[PDB]
RNA sequence: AUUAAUAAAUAAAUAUUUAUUUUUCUUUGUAAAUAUUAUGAACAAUUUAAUUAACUAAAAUGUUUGAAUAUUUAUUUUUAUAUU
């Protein structure tokens, strides 16, 4: 795995990396370093933290520990 | 146990016999596997958990739907223990043996029938009683002594019934998870008198008019004599 | 227990055995000493196989000529015979046989003659002559045609086979016979072939049935479990019949007892005698009048 | 039933109240037990002498 | 059996001691012993009966129970039918099939994902 | 009905005769008279006693 | 205890990648079973007494995260020890026959009887010969740790012109050594 | 066995020997639909020609 | 007539609607269906499956270069006997050990050299007696067993082949 | 290490024993009642089935 | 612990060569006398190469090895299939001893034909010659 | 026992039909996803959608199911350029009916190529899907969407690195 | 299988019950007693010759060249492995 990672990474630093590239890139990763395995969806984690990107209004915005 | 006689049920019911029934079973409601036509596979686990969950709600437990009884209260939990006396020793008897020992050999058997009855009851509702010694009253757990009292057991305060445990060899006891089974009954109900003595004292002392007179009157010559007659003070 | 390749170290004993059927008792003894290392290696003291290959070893030590070898082997598996706890008829059976071979091939024909009688008391006083052929004995009412196949109606198990223990008796009695001959003995013989015909009809004996459905039978092939059974053998049901070996009743868990024991029936809360429960009590007025005192004569009957 | 049906064993469960009674219900201590009307025959009748006595000098053995 | 211990904890046997099918008495009588002193662990309950059950159960150690019927089973299915009691563990009820041969899948080495293998491409 | 067998294997499937080394009918029919006229010749073959 | 050779050298470097976890490709009931420390299996019925401390002796692979040693058709070392947990019946599978023609039907219940059986350990003791080439049959005399016994070379030669051409890190990625 | 883009229909019969297993000379399929519903013909084998 | 009337009514409660609710209904669907389950299961079943499997196989291989084709035949030839589950199983989980065998099948390594056929000794055809001893033929015989014997395992007994042989020394007693 | 006591359907599906004419002439106390006394062997039973 | 036989004796023939020396290999093409066609050998035929009887549960070591064994070395019991195995071997020796014992009874009593083949196959095959005299 | 409803979603229901990229359902996982450019110049048309249908479909990967709908995604580029091996780009037809008597259309390659070459690679991608799995609707469906097509060599899809898709034919 | 009708060995098929260890390399279902027995072809040709399956897995079956293109004869391009 850390083979195929850096023939990516070394198709990927002359065109500079794509969105895919680097979703691959930590995909990768990831396999690389489990030691377990990983059954919940992945866009589970960024569809619960949307709220950090997402920027609310007024005094009912949300941060952390409220 | 959902469908059947659950934690403070006095209904025994084995729900893999089908007794209480006028027709042998033909369709089994909760089937995983068409195996199960000649495998069932019932005892297991996962299959009696299926089997057991289809079967519809009886009468002791309620649909989701249906409003459900506060059997876990103590107001009503009491009440229950001075009917099961009530019904075990009729008004004459229990008039007989307080102005009384020679009784007929029929009235002595109802009384030990009376007593065992009681025993079984307060075994069934311990763990309810026990959950709810926290929000109970004093004027029911006046009503505990004297349902103890007219049931005639006289409870374990270190004739008397629940000083003896039942009998029975350890490697033959039920011992099954998910079944409300207390082997230390005796301990046990040491345990929930002392805990109800002391919740008498802590509601007198939260509690310290002719009418309000009177009522502490009498529940002060009420506790004494009733705690006096099983053995207890304060 | 430590590792040892037994699967081959059987090879070897297996072909021991055959040297041994062949003739070629030095190269059995050869193989017989590798076998008894490895066996000796692994399993504890005392062991039904360390016996087993001992007794093996010290066969092909007195086919061989080592007759001194062969009594010290045989000695010392007697004493873990001893040694061990619940040693085997038919093995400790095989022991006394070699040992009795032993000593002829030494000379000592009394002292053969003396461990021949000795198996043949052991066996006779603990060995069961019927429990081979427990299971084969009502094979036969499995056969459900006459015309043809009827081989397995009578189907036949020789006792030789699937009992060794009688085999080994029957040839150390053989033995003990010959030996009594050579002597010139008569008495010895004579009671040495007695006890050996008695043997042989003690398994006859057990072995025996009568014959069910003779000829063809079609379909009723449930009947297969009736005819495969636990079905007692003749020396069993002889020893333990409903009356010599009686049966415990505890009344506790009775309800009807003899008429002086009849406090004895299971309790009960509180029982009243109604009657005698006769059933035309249900009819009439004559009836029931005709059975007045029914129950104050059972009463006075049962009265004490 | 029949033996060989699957019916004579598709039930396999609630024959038994796994809470045994506590009047008579033992355990099996050990070979030493003797156990009410155990018998190595087939007896469908397992009477003794005690429950049906015999009128007769001597009891029923296969050596008379 | 797991780790030692043997899954199956007390066994019900329920017979008449009179006045039935001889079957069980002769069980008791004849096989039981041998049973008891292979699994000296298991706990024999004989239950005395006016009618018996005419079935051995087994209660094993997560609480489930196997029932075996043995209305005119001989001795020796009885005592057949009590060892595969023991035997069983009464957990699962899968099925012998090439998929459930092997009760949990791993991966020593570790799993094929679709970038294992990917960048790699043919040589000569 | 047919007389149905319990198989050993697939080519018990593919079988159509139960005993294809057997003659058919009109074979067996030919084959036994030759057998009963060779048997009867050999009888004959000493004078009519 | 672990791998041996004649060559010292060969012997130093490749006891160290058998050390791990590693599984095992079993032949057992005319069926394979891939099998780890702690994998639990259903074998066809084995005549064993439960709790029976077993041992597998027909194996056709090892392996593990670093090497992987075949069978042609089996090997040898290989100690793969096993837990009879339970002797059982599997779910019972039904089988009904029955033909529109006569009114026969009959009913079949075939519950598989297997044993169950958790594997405790895994271990091999392989003996190497010495270094074997790929590309040619023989086998070399001395190994050499740090350099590939089979170079490999890129396909791209211009010749082909009309050649599925993919990204040249991938047409063209060197490899590592996997002993240094 | 498929659709017309994948087995001619002409093709259907080409288990059988004979001219069949020959493409046919003309194809009246795409054009229009021939009020005989004929859509192929075989080179006139003699006198004799064959129509699908 | 027999029909699995009381087997199938356990399971009527499967079905759906009247199939479930009338018990004719149910019992002749119930039978429909176990019988049609047994034919798949003696007719096609094991086709469909073994199908999956050659196709997880080949896909593999392609990944890997090879194909189905040529990595059966090639696994013939080296005598590797993994059936197709087993190779699938080894392709889906051990990556490493399927892309090894698959090296092994593309290498030229010299498959295995065929079974030997059992040799006589020249002890056999050696005369015996020449004119307490063992038979030259039969120490041969047993030397090779004692040597399996060693070779199967790290056994305690020694690997002392000539010690093992004069075992029976050990038992002897000198008169 | 004994062989597992595993049931097989030749020995598990067997019936308890019925005194047969045998047993009942070797030891007679165990012809304890008219169930015992049992027909000829010869006697199958009632027909069934149609020819 | 593990096994792996090819023979009954356990010996196999050299597998490995000397170290630089080219390696045997065997015949890929099939046994078909005739040159073409020029097939290579399929699997089942590589299989009975190999030893097995063109199934890998046939013969060879996967029917011939126990499958299992204790873990202090005790071995196996003797199922019924394996005796009915090992009979069925026993039978196939049989079956050869005695066509070979038959065939030196034949030669020894001189039943057996100077002739190669029978007469219905010499007047069917020109390929044998007329042996009259 | 499984119910699918009756009251299904029609082409004519204002909910429409759904995409199955966009869908969430048990057998769809596009976490193992890929990404393949294939460029289908010179390439017969059957060839290209046989390969194109074997990446889309799932059935490179080893751990293919057939249960399981998962593939990686296919850009098919240059579909003008696609070859015809004769004079099949006139002689092989392509023919659907609707339900009206007359009904049927009779077309050609020439046609379906004049309309939309894209709609001809679509058509083969379908035969091949539909040779393979066509029991199910949504087997039928979900691979097709998976699928990509584009005559010219432009596609949006740059943001996804398609990597070429290199095959060989079996000669 | 099938012969109405004077001294001619024998109807067969199916089913039920039952019977005979004869030698030759191998192999081989012969016989008796008993019950039942319309499931029905017209010509031509030739002829002493022509719906069954115990489970798991395994498993080997499967559009040119005696023309074409062209001009007033010359050109053109004529094994495997693997899947029930």
Not at chain 10, 15 to 37: A, E, F, G, R, V
Request: contains cysteine; hydrophobic residues 35%; proline residues 6%.
């Amino acid at each position: 795995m850390r083979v195929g990672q850096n023939i990516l990474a070394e198709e990927t630093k002359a065109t500079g990396m794509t969105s895919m590239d680097t979703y691959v890139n930590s995909r990768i990763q990831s396999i690389i370093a489990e030691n377990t395995v990983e059954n919940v969806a992945l866009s589970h984690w960024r569809r619960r933290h949307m709220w950090n990107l997402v920027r609310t209004h007024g005094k009912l915005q949300r941060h952390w520990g409220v | 146990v959902y469908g059947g006689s659950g934690r403070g049920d006095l209904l025994y019911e084995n729900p893999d016999a089908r007794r209480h029934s006028g027709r042998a079973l033909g369709v089994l409601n909760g089937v995983r596997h068409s195996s199960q036509a000649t495998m069932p596979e019932s005892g297991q686990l996962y299959y009696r958990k299926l089997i057991l969950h289809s079967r519809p709600p009886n009468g002791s437990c309620a649909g989701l739907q249906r409003h459900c009884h506060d059997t876990c209260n103590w107001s009503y939990l009491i009440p229950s223990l001075h009917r099961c006396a009530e019904s075990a020793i009729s008004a004459k008897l229990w008039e007989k043996m307080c102005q009384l020992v020679n009784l007929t050999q029929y009235e002595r058997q109802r009384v030990r029938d009376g007593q065992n009855l009681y025993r079984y009851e307060v075994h069934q509702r311990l763990p309810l009683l026990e959950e709810s010694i926290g929000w109970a009253q004093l004027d029911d757990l006046l009503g505990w002594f004297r349902s103890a009292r007219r049931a005639w057991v006289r409870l374990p305060t270190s004739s008397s019934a629940m000083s003896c445990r039942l009998e029975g060899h350890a490697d033959s006891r039920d011992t099954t998870p998910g079944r409300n089974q207390v082997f230390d009954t005796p301990e046990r109900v040491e345990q929930l008198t002392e805990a109800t003595v002391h919740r008498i004292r802590e509601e007198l002392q939260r509690l310290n008019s002719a009418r309000r007179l009177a009522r502490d009157e009498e529940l002060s010559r009420c506790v004494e004599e009733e705690l006096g007659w099983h053995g207890v003070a304060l | 227990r430590p590792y040892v390749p037994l699967g081959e170290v059987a090879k070897l004993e297996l072909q021991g055995d055959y040297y041994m059927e062949g003739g070629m008792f030095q190269e059995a003894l050869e193989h017989y000493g590798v076998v008894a290392k490895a066996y000796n290696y692994a399993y504890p003291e005392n062991h039904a196989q360390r016996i087993g290959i001992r007794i093996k070893l010290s066969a092909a030590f007195r086919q061989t000529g080592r007759l001194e070898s062969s009594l010290a082997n045989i000695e010392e598996v007697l004493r873990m015979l001893d040694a061990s706890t619940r040693p085997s008829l038919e093995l400790i059976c095989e022991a006394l046989l070699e040992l009795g071979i032993t000593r002829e091939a030494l000379g000592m024909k009394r002292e053969a003659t003396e461990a021949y009688e000795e198996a043949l008391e052991v066996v006779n006083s603990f060995h069961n002559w019927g429990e081979s052929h427990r299971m084969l004995r009502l094979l036969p009412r499995l056969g459900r045609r006459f015309n043809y196949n009827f081989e397995e109606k009578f189907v036949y198990f020789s006792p030789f086979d699937y009992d060794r223990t009688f085999a080994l008796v029957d040839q150390c009695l053989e033995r003990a016979e010959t030996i009594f001959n050579e002597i010139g003995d008569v008495e010895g013989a004579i009671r040495v072939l007695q006890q050996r015909k008695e043997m042989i009809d003690k398994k006859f004996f057990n072995m025996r049935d009568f014959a069910g459905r003779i000829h063809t039978m079609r379909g009723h092939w449930k009947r297969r479990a009736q005819h495969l059974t636990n079905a007692p053998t003749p020396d069993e049901l002889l020893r333990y019949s409903p009356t010599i070996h009686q049966v415990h009743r505890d009344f506790k868990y009775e309800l009807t007892a003899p008429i002086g024991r009849e406090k004895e029936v299971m309790p009960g809360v509180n029982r009243l005698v109604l009657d005698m429960g006769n059933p035309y009590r249900r009819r009439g007025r004559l009836s029931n009048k005709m059975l007045k005192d029914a129950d104050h004569k059972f009463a006075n009957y049962v009265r004490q | 039933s029949s033996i060989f049906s699957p019916r004579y064993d598709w039930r396999t469960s609630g024959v038994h109240d796994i809470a045994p009674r506590d009047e008579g219900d033992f355990l099996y201590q050990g070979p030493q037990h003797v156990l009410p009307g155990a018998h190595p025959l087939p007896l469908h009748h397992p009477h003794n002498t005690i429950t049906r006595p015999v009128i007769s000098p001597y009891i029923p053995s296969p050596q008379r | 059996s797991r780790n030692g211990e043997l899954c199956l904890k007390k066994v019900i046997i329920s017979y008449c001691p009179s006045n039935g099918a001889p079957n069980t008495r002769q069980f008791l009588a004849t096989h039981l012993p041998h049973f008891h002193a292979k699994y000296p662990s298991v706990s024999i309950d004989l239950r005395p009966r006016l009618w018996p059950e005419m079935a051995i159960t087994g209660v094993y150690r997560d609480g489930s129970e196997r029932s075996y019927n043995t209305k005119n089973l001989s001795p020796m299915g009885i005592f057949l039918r009590l060892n595969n009691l023991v035997s069983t563990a009464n957990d699962y009820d899968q099925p012998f099939c090439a998929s459930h041969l092997h009760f949990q899948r791993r991966s020593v080495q570790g799993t094929w994902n679709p970038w294992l293998w990917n960048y790699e491409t043919e040589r000569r | 009905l047919v007389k149905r067998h319990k198989i050993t294997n697939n080519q018990m499937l593919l079988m159509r005769r139960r005993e294809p080394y057997k003659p058919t009918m009109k074979d067996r029919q030919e084959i036994a008279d030759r057998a009963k006229l060779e048997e009867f010749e050999r009888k004959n073959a000493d004078g009519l006693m | 205890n672990g791998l041996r050779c004649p060559d010292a050298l060969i012997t130093r470097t490749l006891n160290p990648l058998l050390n791990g976890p590693k599984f095992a490709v079993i032949y057992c009931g005319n069926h394979q079973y891939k099998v780890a420390v702690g994998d639990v299996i259903a074998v066809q019925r084995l005549r064993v007494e439960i709790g029976s401390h077993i041992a597998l002796k027909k194996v056709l692979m090892v392996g593990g995260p670093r090497f992987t040693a075949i069978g042609r058709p089996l090997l040898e070392g290989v100690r793969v020890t096993a837990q009879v947990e339970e002797q059982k019946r599997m779910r019972n599978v039904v089988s009904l026959f029955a033909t529109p023609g006569r009114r026969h039907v009959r009913w079949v219940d075939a519950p598989h009887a297997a044993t169950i059986i958790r594997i405790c350990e895994i271990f091999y003791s392989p003996n190497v010969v010495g270094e074997l080439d790929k590309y040619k049959g023989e086998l070399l005399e001395t190994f050499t740790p740090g350099q590939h016994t089979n170079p490999v070379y890129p396909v791209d030669d211009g010749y082909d012109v009309f050649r599925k051409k993919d990204k040249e890190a991938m047409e063209n990625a060197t490899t590592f050594l996997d002993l240094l | 066995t498929g659709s017309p883009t994948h087995q001619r229909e002409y093709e259907r019969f080409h288990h059988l020997p004979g001219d069949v297993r020959t493409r046919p000379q003309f194809d009246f399929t795409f054009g229009e639909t021939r009020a005989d519903r004929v859509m192929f013909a075989w080179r006139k084998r003699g006198d004799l020609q064959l129509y699908q | 007539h027999y029909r699995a009337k009381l087997e199938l009514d356990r399971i009527r409660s499967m079905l759906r609607g009247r199939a479930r609710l009338e018990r004719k209904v149910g019992l002749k669907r119930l039978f429909f269906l176990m019988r049609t389950q047994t034919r798949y299961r003696v007719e096609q079943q094991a086709h469909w499956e073994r199908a999956i499997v050659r196709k997880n196989v080949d896909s593999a291989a392609r990944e890997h270069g090879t194909g189905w084709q040529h990595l059966r035949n090639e696994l013939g030839r080296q005598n590797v006997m993994l059936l197709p589950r087993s190779q699938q199983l080894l392709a889906q989980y051990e990556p490493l050990a399927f892309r090894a065998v698959v090296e092994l099948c593309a290498s030229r390594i010299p498959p295995p050299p065929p079974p030997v056929v059992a040799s006589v000794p020249e002890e056999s055809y050696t005369l015996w007696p020449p004119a307490s001893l063992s038979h030259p033929a039969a120490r041969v015989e047993l030397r090779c067993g004692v040597e399996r014997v060693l070779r199967r395992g790290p056994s305690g007994l020694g690997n002392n082949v000539n010690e093992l042989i004069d075992a029976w020394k050990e038992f002897d007693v000198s008169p | 290490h004994p062989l597992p006591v595993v049931g097989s359907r030749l020995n598990g599906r067997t019936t308890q024993h019925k005194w047969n004419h045998w047993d009942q002439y070797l030891n007679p106390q165990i012809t304890q009642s008219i169930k015992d006394l049992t027909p000829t062997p010869e006697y199958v039973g009632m027909r069934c089935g149609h020819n | 612990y593990s096994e792996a036989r090819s023979n009954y004796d356990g010996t196999s023939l050299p597998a490995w060569p000397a170290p630089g020396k080219k390696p045997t290999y065997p015949a890929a093409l099939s046994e078909l006398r005739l040159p073409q066609p020029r097939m290579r050998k399929t699997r089942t035929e590589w299989m009975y190469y190999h030893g097995h009887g063109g199934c890998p549960g046939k013969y060879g070591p996967s029917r011939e090895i126990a499958d299992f064994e204790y873990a202090d070395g005790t071995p196996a019991s003797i199922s019924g299939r394996r005796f009915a195995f090992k009979h069925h071997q026993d039978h196939l020796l049989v079956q050869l001893i005695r066509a070979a014992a038959t065939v030196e009874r034949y030669d020894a009593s001189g039943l057996l034909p100077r002739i190669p083949g029978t007469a219905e196959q010499r007047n069917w095959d020109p390929a044998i010659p007329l042996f009259l005299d | 026992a499984p119910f699918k409803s009756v009251l299904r979603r029609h082409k004519h229901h204002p909910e429409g039909l759904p995409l199955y990229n966009d869908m969430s359902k048990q057998w769809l996982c596009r976490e193992g996803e890929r990404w393949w450019l294939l460029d289908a110049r010179g390439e017969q048309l059957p060839r290209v959608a046989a390969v194109a249908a074997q990446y889309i479909t799932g059935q490179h990967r080893p751990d293919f199911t057939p249960g399981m709908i998962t593939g990686d995604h296919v850009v098919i580029v240059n579909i003008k350029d696609v070859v015809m091996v004769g004079d099949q780009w006139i002689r092989v037809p392509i023919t659907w009916q609707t339900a009206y008597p007359g009904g049927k259309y009779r077309i050609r390659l020439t046609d379906m190529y004049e309309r939309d070459p894209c709609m001809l690679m679509w058509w083969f991608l379908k035969d091949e899907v539909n040779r393979h799995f066509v029991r199910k609707l949504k087997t039928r469906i979900a691979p097709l969407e998976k699928a990509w097509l584009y005559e010219d060599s432009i596609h949006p899809h740059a943001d996804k690195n398609p990597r070429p898709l290199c095959w060989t034919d079996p000669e």
